[PDB]
Design a protein around this ligand. Structure first.
Ligand SMILES: *[C@@H]1O[C@H](CO)[C@@H](O)[C@H](O)[C@H]1NC(C)=O
Ligand SMILES: *[C@@H]1O[C@H](CO)[C@@H](O)[C@H](O)[C@H]1NC(C)=O
Ligand SMILES: *[C@@H]1O[C@H](CO)[C@@H](O)[C@H](O)[C@H]1NC(C)=O
Ligand SMILES: [Cl-]
Lengths: 98, 264
């Protein structure tokens, strides 16, 4: 099996009170079954949309999850990932610079 | 260069249960997919359906659905313990040359397992184990199917490709210019060039020190390209420096002329 490689990043350079999109991309994993949840202040973000599961030329699976958001000072954003390679769900915080 | 690619995958959970998915791609433009519950094909681009008559679509759908169904049946009939995953990647590529490349590969547990040989019209065993050896001999035995696969790959896939290049030319030729910012992270200082919004995917992001390209070393990381949801892409590149002038240079076909972003 292969553990997912996860990046969390926004569509545009973020700015407090300016509309944006938060992206969580999981890749390089096998088998394809995986949960990916975008989180805000410890709770699942509303409005999340899931790309079709796909795989790359070297057979590893990948998936893009995205939600519209307006980052505010004081909120925290993360992507939580469960996959059979992980003993527990892994929380990847959004670094608001990325 | 253009490519039409059909992707399929299947997790066999037990002897009676299999979760299938599939995707149709024209370069990185998603043409459609397989409804993992009903198995009906979904069409994502408006130029697709009118590009061929209904009867052609009917034959394409029925051949896709037979492929998927027969795949699952063959595996269950001839396999090795549950759970496991098979994948297929099937398609053709046209160079500007006019040169055709075809491909029809099956993977097993994420590694090449069987590969079609177009000229001989047979199968190459890709894993050095009994399961792959069995699969190769089984598929070697399907002479007639293999004759038909040859035509599907070399004639019908290519013909449909040429037609899709024309029908979907607006998608294929779509361009979106990159936007780039540069900022520094505490470290030595780590300079970051973050580029987003670009389409198509090929791009070249390099660092200049006094107008001069910084050579590769472990001080310079260029990251991996990341997708956005609106079919544009993002890249980050970094340079460990010591507090010379620095700028990030972004070259992209949407620009003809490059983006030059100084570090301040
Ligand atoms: C196969 O898998 C499904 C779903 O996980 C289950 O409902 C079904 O009864 C299984 N069959 C056997 C023989 O265990
Ligand atoms: C594939 O197609 C071209 C004609 O368009 C032909 O010249 C070439 O020999 C073909 N290869 C095979 C294996 O059929
Ligand atoms: C292929 O066919 C031969 C002869 O018709 C048969 O004896 C053999 O078992 C077949 N090979 C496989 C893997 O089915
Ligand atoms: Cl977006």
């Amino acid at each position: 099996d292969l553990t997912p490689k996860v990046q969390v990043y926004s569509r545009f350079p973020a700015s407090a009170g300016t509309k944006n999109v938060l992206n969580c991309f999981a890749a390089g994993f096998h088998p394809p079954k995986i949960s990916i949840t975008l989180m805000k202040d410890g709770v699942p973000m509303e409005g999340a949309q899931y790309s079709d599961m796909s795989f790359n030329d070297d057979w590893t699976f990948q998936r893009l999850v995205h939600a519209d958001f307006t980052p505010s000072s004081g909120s925290t954003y993360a992507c939580k990932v469960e996959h059979e390679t992980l003993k527990e769900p892994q929380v990847y915080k959004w670094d608001p610079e990325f | 260069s253009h490519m039409l690619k059909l992707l399929h995958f299947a997790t066999f959970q037990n002897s009676t249960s299999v979760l299938v998915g599939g995707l149709g791609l024209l370069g990185d433009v998603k043409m459609g997919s397989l409804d993992s519950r009903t198995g009906n094909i979904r069409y994502y681009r408006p130029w697709l359906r009118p590009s061929l008559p209904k009867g052609d679509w009917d034959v394409i759908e029925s051949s896709i659905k037979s492929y998927v169904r027969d795949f699952s049946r063959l595996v269950q009939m001839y396999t090795v313990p549950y759970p496991f995953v098979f994948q297929s990647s099937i398609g053709c590529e046209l160079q500007s040359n006019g040169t055709i490349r075809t491909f029809f590969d099956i993977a097993y547990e994420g590694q090449n397992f069987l590969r079609f040989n177009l000229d001989a019209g047979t199968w190459d065993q890709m894993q050095h184990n009994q399961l792959s050896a069995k699969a190769e001999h089984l598929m070697a035995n399907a002479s007639t199917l293999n004759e038909v696969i040859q035509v599907l790959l070399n004639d019908t896939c290519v013909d449909i490709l040429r037609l899709f290049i024309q029908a979907g030319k607006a998608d294929l030729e779509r361009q979106v210019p990159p936007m780039a910012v540069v900022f520094a992270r505490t470290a030595q200082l780590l300079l970051v060039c973050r580029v987003t919004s670009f389409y198509p995917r090929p791009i070249a992001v390099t660092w200049l020190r006094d107008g001069r390209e910084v050579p590769p070393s472990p001080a310079l990381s260029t990251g991996t390209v990341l997708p956005n949801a609106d079919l544009t892409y993002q890249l980050r590149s970094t340079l460990l420096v010591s507090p010379h002038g620095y700028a990030c240079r972004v070259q992209h076909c949407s620009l003809g002329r490059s983006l030059l972003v100084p570090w301040h």
